[PDB]
Amino acid sequence: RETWGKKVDFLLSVIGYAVDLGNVWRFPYICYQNGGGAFLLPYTIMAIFGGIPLFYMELALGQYHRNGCISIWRKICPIFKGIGYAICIIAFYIASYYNTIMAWALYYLISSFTDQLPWTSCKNSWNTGNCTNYFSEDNITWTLHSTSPAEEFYTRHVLQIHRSKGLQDLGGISWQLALCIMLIFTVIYFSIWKGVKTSGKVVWVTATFPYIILSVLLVRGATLPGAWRGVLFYLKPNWQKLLETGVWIDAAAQIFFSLGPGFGVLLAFASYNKFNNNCYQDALVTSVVNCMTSFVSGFVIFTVLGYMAEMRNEDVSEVAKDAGPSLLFITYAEAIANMPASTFFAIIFFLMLITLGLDSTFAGLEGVITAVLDEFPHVWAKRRERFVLAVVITCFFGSLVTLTFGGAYVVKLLEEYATGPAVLTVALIEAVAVSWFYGITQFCRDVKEMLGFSPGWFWRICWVAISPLFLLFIICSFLMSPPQLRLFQYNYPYWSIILGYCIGTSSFICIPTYIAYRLIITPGTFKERIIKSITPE
Amino acid sequence: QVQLQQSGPELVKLGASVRISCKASGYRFSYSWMNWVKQRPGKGLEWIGRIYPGDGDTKYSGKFKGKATLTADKSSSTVYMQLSSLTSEDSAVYFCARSAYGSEGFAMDYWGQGTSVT
Amino acid sequence: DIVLTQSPASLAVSLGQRATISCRASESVDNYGISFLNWFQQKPGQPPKLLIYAASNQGSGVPARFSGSGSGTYFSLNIHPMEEDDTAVYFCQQTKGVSWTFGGGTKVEI
Ligand SMILES: *[C@@H]1O[C@H](CO)[C@@H](O[C@@H]2O[C@H](CO)[C@@H](O)[C@H](O)[C@H]2NC(C)=O)[C@H](O)[C@H]1NC(C)=O
Ligand SMILES: CC(C)CCC[C@@H](C)[C@H]1CC[C@H]2[C@@H]3CC=C4C[C@@H](O)CC[C@]4(C)[C@H]3CC[C@]12C
Ligand SMILES: CCCCCCCCCCCC
Ligand SMILES: CCCCCCCCCCCC
Ligand SMILES: CCCCCCCCCCCC
Ligand SMILES: CCCCCCCCCC
Ligand SMILES: CCCCCCC
Ligand SMILES: CCCCCCC
Ligand SMILES: CCCCCCC
Ligand SMILES: CCCCCCC
Ligand SMILES: CCCCCCC
Ligand SMILES: CCCCC
Secondary structure, eight states: OOOOOOHHHHHHHHHHHHSOHHHHHHHHHHHHHHTSGGGTTTTHHHHHHHHHHHHHHHHHHHHHHOSOSSGGGGGTOGGGTHHHHHHHHHHHHHHHHHHHHHHHHHHHHHHTOSSSOTTSSOOTTSOTTTBOOOOOSSOOOOOTTOBOHHHHHIIIIIIOGGGOOSTTSOOOOOHHHHHHHHHHHHHHHHHHSSOHHHHHHHHTTSSHHHHHHHHHHHHHHTTSTTOSHHHHHHTOOOOSSSSSSOSHHHHHHHHHHHHOOSSSHHHHHHTSOOOTTOHHHHHHHHHHHHHHHHHHHHHHHHHHHHHHHHHHTSOSSSTTSSOSSHHHHHHHHHHHHHSTTTTTHHHHHHHHHHHHHHHHHHHHHHHHHTTHHHHOHHHHHHTHHHHHHHHHHHHHHHHHHHHHHTSSHHHHHHHHHIIIIIHHHHHHHHHHIIIIITTHHHHHHHHHHHHSSOOTTTHHHIIIIIHHHHHHHHHHHHHHSOOOOBOSSOBOOHHHHHHHHHHHHHSSTHHHHHHHHHHHHSOSOHHHHHHHHSOOO | OOOOEEOOOOOOOTTOOOEEOEEOOSSOTTSSOEEEEEEOTTSOEEEEEEEETTTTEEEEOTTOTTTEEEEEETTTTEEEEEEOSOOTTTOSEEOOEEOOOTTTTSOOOBOOOOEEOO | OOOOEEEOSEEEOOTTOOEEEEEEOSOOOEETTEEOOEEEEEOSSSOOEEOEETTTEEOSSOOTTOOOEEETTEEEEEEOOOOSSOOOEEEEEEOOSSOOEEOOOEEEEO
């Protein structure tokens, strides 16, 4: 089949997918929401135990099989073939949720071109009454309804939630966001139409730019006065509330979404070349660099937050407690507005966001567009371009549901419902099929001689008990404790909670309905049926 | 409240320059715009320009940017309008309005007494 | 610069009947769901007085007899039958950026 070619290009694409605008969006936000310092100490061990097996085993299976992500299960467990459609639906939901954020970032990049950025002062298009956050000398009198210029810019300019009274009420049209989505999808299509050649050609040029932007932002934030309270709040042990009512399950979900295992993209990337004697090293290097990037992102987030809190002369907690997605887009907005080096830092930060989001959504769409073609050979023969066009069509059609609605409500719903229980139980089914059903002995007997080292005594005991135990504990705790939704002082109703639970439990029903279809098409009785249907070809 | 007090009447000569003051008080004048209108005797209203005290943002229009200039004073809470090349055509009475907030549509709720500059 | 036009120019209606004031333009001033339009009450000698908030809401201190609605290009000012003192000229103001222009003016008399 197709070969990756440059090993450096392959590894760079893997680490560029590992680094995610979604991770940069979720990790520091939920960290500051749950307490800040009490998020990184019980983080690295869970990150290891949750991602290192799910990354290494998946990469090994991909490099051993090299037949895509949907048709790969035919040689392991054909009963669990519905996991391919599950991964497809989950990636579609992720792209539908991700394109709106990409459009927001690109619109911010476009609007950050004027010399007078609309973040230093509220203009003639926002509520100047609510707009009062201006750092003067004894001129601010905070009240129960005090807002910020960046908050108003995020609320009544790009999202326009003031016209939407909730999920039960529709919203107005957004032609600017529609054109932004059109441009982003055109770029994605022009980058994904050719194939793996352009895949490797576009990633290597947008890979070091986010890193250099992160480094220059860190070295800039390390100079502004007031970067001490932020790091002190970011480095507090706080051993009080991590035993039972802790945020461990949200940290696990976040690191899972950041490393992105079981999303089919890693399996599809490993399904190209054999990649001998480098699977373990690739997995470890990718996970380490992703964890380091997430740590640097959280560090700069908390540095900027502490600088803002010290300039405001108030605690770090009160700054954007209810703003879920708006936290970043108001904090960095006010940071650029306060720093005397504006009109360039905002531009480079938005360009870093655009590059990261492009790389992430490109890998996410590729992990499906190169996996469905293996299941559909008649399509893969000639109609690859038409199938790419059709999947782009349906992707932006699904994104239009959130676009026309004009609100981040569906965005938050997909943020804490799509990439949560659905992909969690998908990874659980994958791990169960790899460990219990498929023999770990014969699964490792080949990678042993392929990598020259013995993977025993760590994965032989991690893949069987601790990883599935944690991955099931997280999901049962999630199903037991309803994650109440809050956004912009708007409590989501019980009907919204029920709809979220329904979409979460239906985003993976394809696997059991395919199991039932296979059981009803296969004749006979239960025992012989299962013993001749669970046959790794 | 309604405290947009202005000065008395001025004298107009061919090629002169006058200054019209506008004392603002009773609200956050550092975050609200200040508008200036022009009304001729027996004619309708004409817009001159707007000024945002606190940031110096000015947006002149109405073919008046060549002879009018707005200046804000946060220390004295006054709004000044610099005039130049006065003529009997534009010699009329000028007011001093105050724009509302964003959700209110920037409506001139509070007005001044009026400077009968003739 | 966006120009506003008013029609009719004079309304010689008596006491006891309602009237309508029109303020048309190429815009389409609707932005963020807020119709940028303001109606003023200018009496001879007296400064103008604000009547309508964003062409949909009533102002402060104005009696409930003043009202009006509209969307996009077409804007109307449905006024209750006026009294012997409510006779005055009315202007419509467009507050959409970046330039602000006033209307012509109607001669509401009895
Ligand atoms: C600041 O914003 C709040 C909204 O959170 C404004 O409060 C509202 O006032 C309007 C009009 O009186 C009501 O329709 C809303 O229901 C109110 N909302 C809440 C949550 O109370 C407040 O008026 C704004 N303040 C300023 C000075 O503009
Ligand atoms: C001063 C610091 C912040 C700048 C360095 C940023 C680091 C974390 C990033 C930026 C560029 C990245 C490298 C880009 C290219 C390659 C070559 C590939 O075959 C192995 C990974 C490797 C080596 C990456 C490792 C991580 C890397 C070095
Ligand atoms: C965030 C830091 C991750 C460090 C991962 C170390 C993994 C060590 C595995 C050792 C196996 C014998
Ligand atoms: C005034 C119009 C400016 C338009 C700028 C478009 C920039 C597009 C960047 C796309 C990056 C992927
Ligand atoms: C009034 C501001 C309009 C901003 C429009 C941004 C998008 C322009 C088209 C970009 C196409 C790629
Ligand atoms: C090549 C044209 C493909 C068109 C696909 C249309 C999909 C519509 C999904 C609602
Ligand atoms: C009224 C529609 C509610 C669900 C929106 C997301 C599909
Ligand atoms: C004004 C509505 C625009 C919809 C665009 C759909 C592609
Ligand atoms: C044709 C591909 C353009 C990619 C631009 C990334 C910023
Ligand atoms: C073109 C209008 C689309 C409405 C979608 C509502 C979810
Ligand atoms: C009212 C929108 C559909 C809700 C379905 C809940 C199961
Ligand atoms: C920004 C558009 C690029 C098309 C190739």
